[PDB]
Amino acid sequence: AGPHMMDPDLLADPFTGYGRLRERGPVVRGRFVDGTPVWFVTRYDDVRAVLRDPRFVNTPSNVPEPLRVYLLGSILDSDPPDHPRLRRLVTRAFAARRILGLRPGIERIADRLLAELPRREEEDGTVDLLEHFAYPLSITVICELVGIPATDLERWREWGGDLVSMRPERLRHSFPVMIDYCHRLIEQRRAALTDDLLSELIRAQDDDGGRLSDIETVTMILTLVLAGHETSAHLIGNGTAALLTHPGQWALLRKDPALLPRAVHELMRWCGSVHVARLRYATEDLELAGTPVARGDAVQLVLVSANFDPRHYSDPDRLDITRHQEGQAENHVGFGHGIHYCLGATLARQEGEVALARLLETYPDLALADGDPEVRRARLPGSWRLDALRLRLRP
């Protein structure tokens, strides 16, 4: 039967647990959260090889009928020949938006949130960085990227939560409501374009002149909120916990904040919030690192064990924010690889860099509230997240 993704030891310590399978062999049979059979692929080179292989696709072998297309149509569920067009349109929109020009706006959001922080302390004088900094920053950045009005922040926060939980008794109401909200925002921006990402999505053109349909644009908005909201927040939370538990790294960055871009690469590798890829499926019988894979078989790529692969990294278990060299090409799979590579990666790297920078400058003596932060580590299959991160702002 093999390892199951809800196995307690994998949930509690995926580093050790998937690292064991990694060392046992490149391809090991096991079970998806479903109990569904999977092949665990766990080593750096095989993970990348599978993510580059067109023989591995994302389509496998209570919500109403007109609304279904808004979930089935998400780009991460899309295969060639449909995926390249969708990918081109949204990435052309990102390029016209100029993601790096967003850095001052991200700083302003982070500074604003950091100034509020002392007013969110509990009775013990500690403050939860997740609820009052990381989560608000991530959802504010995404909403402002898209062009969602500030007054609708809370609504989108709720809608984001609705989308992750997918309870029918909730979604049979809110899903139509949010789809209609999006179509109206599209028609509003069309009649008066601005410089937000929605306007660039409306304006984007494929080389033959083709455009996104409004249903595709709505689907893309939902997809962006869902894919960027919680991942980014837990990069910030994990990375902050990583630095405070390794105080020389925190000290290094407070002395040399110009190290942040390289540091963020190592934090992605060492504690990125996503540990697995979406399930892949073989389209034909094939040989994968010496294992016969049958057409229709599901493969679970394990990003975390690849990012800790001693075949590729020297002493991977160490946190070392100087590991990545100045000007070195990206050298981890925490954002994936190949055609489904995270299209939010530039935004996420900027978010984490800015969040850390402002946190370092505004609370240079930030401390863990007394505790191993890991006590708050959620037990999530393929994700890596803290329920909270309680800190003391000042000595």
Residue positions annotated with a catalytic role:
227, 230, 232, 342, 351
**Does 215 interact with ligand HEM (rule: CB under 6 A)?**
no
**Does 241 interact with ligand HEM (rule: CB under 6 A)?**
no
Amino acid identity of 216? E
271, 274, 275, 277 alpha-carbon torsion, rounded to 10°: -150
**Does 373 interact with ligand HEM (rule: CB under 6 A)?**
no
Distance (Å, whole) CA 49 – CA 86: 23
- Name the one range near ligand HEM by CB under 6 A: 59-67, 183-191, 250-258, 268-276: 268-276
**Per-residue contact string for residues 60-79; x = within reach of ligand HEM by CB under 6 A:** ---------------xx---
Among 109, 137, 218, 227, interactor with ligand HEM by CB under 6 A: 227
Among 235, 306, 356, 391, interactor with ligand HEM by CB under 6 A: 235
Distance (Å, whole) CA 310 – CA 316: 6
Could you tell me the smallest distance in angstroms from the CB atom of residue 100 to ligand HEM? 14
* Minimum CB distance to ligand HEM smaller for 321 or for 393: 321
Could you tell me the smallest distance in angstroms from the CB atom of residue 369 to ligand HEM? 24
* Minimum CB distance to ligand HEM smaller for 137 or for 348: 348
Contact assessment for residue 156 and residue 198, using Cβ atoms and an 8 Å cutoff:
no
**Does 224 interact with ligand HEM (rule: CB under 6 A)?**
yes
What is the per-residue DSSP string for 88-115? Answer: HHHHHHHHHH-GGGGHHHHHHHHHHHHH
Query: Which H helix or E strand runs over 198?
Result: helix 197-203
What is the CB neighbour count within 10 angstroms for residue 96? 14
* Minimum CB distance to ligand HEM smaller for 43 or for 393: 43
Contact assessment for residue 118 and residue 384, using Cβ atoms and an 8 Å cutoff:
no
Could you tell me the smallest distance in angstroms from the CB atom of residue 370 to ligand HEM? 28
Could you tell me the smallest distance in angstroms from the CB atom of residue 154 to ligand HEM? 20
**Does 277 interact with ligand HEM (rule: CB under 6 A)?**
yes
* Minimum CB distance to ligand HEM smaller for 253 or for 303: 303
Residue count at the site for ligand HEM (CB under 6 A)? 25
Among 147, 237, 272, 316, interactor with ligand HEM by CB under 6 A: 272
* Minimum CB distance to ligand HEM smaller for 39 or for 393: 39
* Minimum CB distance to ligand HEM smaller for 243 or for 393: 243
> Residue for token digits 């080389």?
207
Q: Point out the residue whose Cβ comes nearest to ligand HEM.
A: 344
CA angle centred on 220, ends 64 and 194, rounded to 5°? 125
Can the peptide bond before residue 149 be classed as cis, meaning omega within 30 degrees of 0?
no
* Minimum CB distance to ligand HEM smaller for 185 or for 268: 268
- Name the one range near ligand HEM by CB under 6 A: 117-125, 160-168, 228-236, 311-319: 228-236
Among 140, 273, 305, 307, interactor with ligand HEM by CB under 6 A: 273
Token pair listed for 368: 């863990």
CA angle centred on 112, ends 109 and 117, rounded to 5°? 120
Contact assessment for residue 84 and residue 104, using Cβ atoms and an 8 Å cutoff:
no
Among 335, 363, 373, 389, interactor with ligand HEM by CB under 6 A: 335
Among 73, 239, 336, 382, interactor with ligand HEM by CB under 6 A: 336
What is the per-residue DSSP string for 334-365? Answer: TT--GGG--TTHHHHHHHHHHHHHHHHHH-TT
Of 2, 1, 3, which is closest to residue 381 (Cα–Cα)?
3
Q: Which stretches of the chain are assigned E, i.e. beta strand?
A: 27-31, 37-41, 56-57, 127-128, 280-282, 286-288, 291-293, 298-301, 367-368, 390-392
Distance (Å, whole) CA 351 – CA 108: 12
- Name the one range near ligand HEM by CB under 6 A: 201-209, 287-295, 330-338, 382-390: 330-338
List residues near ligand HEM by CB under 6 A: 75-76, 87, 223-224, 227-228, 231-232, 235, 272-274, 277-278, 303, 334-336, 340, 342-344, 347-348
